[PDB]
Design a protein around this ligand. Structure first.
Ligand SMILES: N#Cc1ccc(CN(Cc2c[nH]cn2)C(=O)CSc2ccccc2Cl)cc1
Ligand SMILES: N#Cc1ccc(CN(Cc2c[nH]cn2)C(=O)CSc2ccccc2Cl)cc1
Ligand SMILES: N#Cc1ccc(CN(Cc2c[nH]cn2)C(=O)CSc2ccccc2Cl)cc1
Ligand SMILES: [Cl-]
Ligand SMILES: [Cl-]
Ligand SMILES: [Cl-]
Ligand SMILES: [Cl-]
Ligand SMILES: [Cl-]
Ligand SMILES: [Cl-]
Lengths: 258, 258, 258
């Protein structure tokens, strides 16, 4: 019936909204901030500088705000930001940024990060993502809204996981995953679009069909990527949903003068 | 040398047989019941309604009987049941069931579940299994007696792992695995039968042979599953061991009226 | 600020050099030696007999020194040895040896072992190695100096990972990785040599070229291993760096009288 367990350790410099809860044997280190309504389980380690928003649930054996062990990082003061309404399940690791990117690891709102997931330095997670058990973002990975990374999905540094994209269990992602796309295997290859994601968002059935077509343009017609982007111009102007897709491919590929 | 560490937390409503041990900083939650001579390590978390049987050994950092995070599950009073003589190693996660199935995750007797493995909601495990480090049953997975899942084996929802079957390390299993079959890879593919295990269980020469022939019927003679089953009916009447194999195949493949 | 937290448990048979630190809720079991300047985080479990050198850092939720659960192990008094200047990150498991090999798991100096990495019974790791998150040495694995195992690399028992070798993420290694070689995928396959490694170690550019040719000899040229071994003798006499590669291939393939 008492919010901060007396067997937890709270740095004087940490700053908790009053109705925060911290379970027994949890450490809330210096420079950690925790928002209205957040619940910290038993045996959690928070290190900062780290800003956690409201209504987060962080489960046992999680390390949130540790330094990345990557030799690149040499002790510079770098940040972790986690938004509102996230659930961080048991044993998750989330590391702070590195000064060679934007010095921040960033998690939005309403995400579900399942047991043993790992969220490496400088990674950016948007909103409503699901990282299933043991998903690992190596570093500087961007995961846009509604993405679902199935169990034990691995993501190479710098890859972008597009909105509503979906990886199958054990996927090893080496390159960007365009919005809506489903990918499978080691290495990750594209199979289809996430029609289920599209239903659950109540996408019009013209938009669902347009996105099937945009898939075929990119993947099943021998277009080069530059050829696909050009063909997609029309659909992208017709349908905001296709434009999200065109844009995710556009961002992955600048190229070099040939 | 006093069985329940005073540094542990034991809910009033927990039920511990007389000679149970509980290490320090371990939580035995409400509606958790533990049988004779079971040993709980330190830093274990137990949540209920959970019933754990006799002579089990649960290692540090395990979270046994927690709710699945799956959005489908809505806080209902589902259960976990663990039998006798199991060994659950460091960091294992085991979740209670969901009302959509039978409201019960179930583990039998004499199993070895190694570090960081995950036993998803509604999974049923038989007896004498080995889940090696980081094996992950996504949900509603049935693992029949003596099955060995090598390290980092992933099993998709609703899959049945047959008696005596074997998965190689990093297998990504997405369809049922019949009794005795060895599977490998991502996605998992059948390679042989688990003769090592047949030897250990003291199978006759004749039975080991019958099982090799039965493998050849299903996997190496162009037969459909329907034709393979027909061909096995004889071998299955002659050898209990083959019948286990015939039945594992039967109950994967109900089919649709063509 | 007391170097040993009063909330930690220290066996009287443990021997700590004077400026050892142990965080809260850590256990240092019987027969654990910890060298000068080492730091044990909170929530660590150390079991013995184990010998840990100078200036190591072991992080929260790590279990270092436990028994392997492999059923061949029968409680014999096997050992774990860890040199100096290693970093063992959140949740690593390291198991002691088995009497059927040398009764010792062994780790050298300046290694980096990242979250949830698993160092199985009897493994031998040299110096300046990096095992990224979730790397798993199943048992009796030899890793030689400067090797890099990317995230979720799995290594089959008895495999030798060669000096400066490199595995890509999700690699499933069933066989020896010769020095400098890069391998990828499940099953793991050779692709190139770890030129980046050779750079960072100041190799002559003649030696880098000699190691590229040596690769071509072994992998890209029809040769049997015995044929490649014989072609490499000249190159191995000219360049110590090549000799290390010849020797990794030598000491992998004894063969049988045919
Ligand atoms: N709330 C939710 C939610 C949403 C999507 C998923 C995705 N999901 C189911 C799926 C894959 N393809 C079709 N359905 C998996 O990740 C299974 S793998 C796994 C699962 C759990 C633990 C360990 C492992 Cl390994 C899972 C959960
Ligand atoms: N008691 C036992 C017992 C039985 C079977 C196995 C199966 N096993 C060994 C094997 C594969 N093929 C032939 N023998 C593995 O899982 C190796 S992988 C691994 C192993 C350990 C940790 C991490 C990892 Cl990744 C392992 C142990
Ligand atoms: N110090 C270092 C160091 C050296 C090599 C590697 C190897 N490396 C790539 C890399 C090169 N530089 C930065 N990162 C990976 O393992 C990526 S996978 C991964 C990574 C991290 C968590 C989970 C996963 Cl899955 C990684 C780090
Ligand atoms: Cl059409
Ligand atoms: Cl098509
Ligand atoms: Cl059933
Ligand atoms: Cl025959
Ligand atoms: Cl054949
Ligand atoms: Cl040349």
């Amino acid at each position: 019936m008492s919010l901060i367990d007396p067997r937890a350790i709270i740095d004087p410099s940490a700053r908790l909204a009053a109705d925060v809860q911290v379970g027994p044997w949890s450490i809330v280190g210096a420079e950690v901030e925790i928002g209205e309504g957040t619940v910290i389980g038993p045996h959690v380690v928070l290190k900062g500088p780290t800003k956690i928003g409201k209504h987060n649930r962080i489960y046992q054996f999680s390390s949130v705000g540790e330094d990345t062990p990557d030799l690149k990082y040499k002790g510079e003061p770098t940040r972790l930001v986690i938004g509102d309404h996230n659930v961080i399940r048991e044993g998750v690791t989330i590391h702070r940024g590195t000064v060679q990117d934007r010095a921040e690891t960033t998690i939005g709102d309403h995400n579900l990060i399942m047991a043993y997931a790992h969220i490496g330095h400088d990674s950016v997670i948007g909103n409503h993502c699901i990282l299933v058990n043991n998903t690992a973002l190596a570093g500087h990975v961007h995961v846009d809204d509604w993405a679902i990374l199935s169990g034990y999905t691995l993501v190479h540094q710098y890859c972008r996981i597009g909105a509503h994209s979906f990886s199958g269990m054990g996927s090893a992602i080496g390159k960007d995953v365009p919005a809506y796309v489903t990918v499978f295997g080691n290495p990750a290859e594209a199979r289809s679009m996430n029609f289920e994601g599209m239903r659950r968002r109540g996408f019009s059935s013209e938009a669902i069909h347009a996105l099937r077509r945009a898939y075929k343009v990119v993947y099943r017609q021998g277009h080069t990527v530059e050829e696909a982007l050009a063909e997609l111009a029309e659909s992208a102007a017709q349908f905001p949903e296709v434009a999200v897709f065109r844009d995710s491919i556009q961002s992955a590929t600048r190229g070099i003068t040939r």
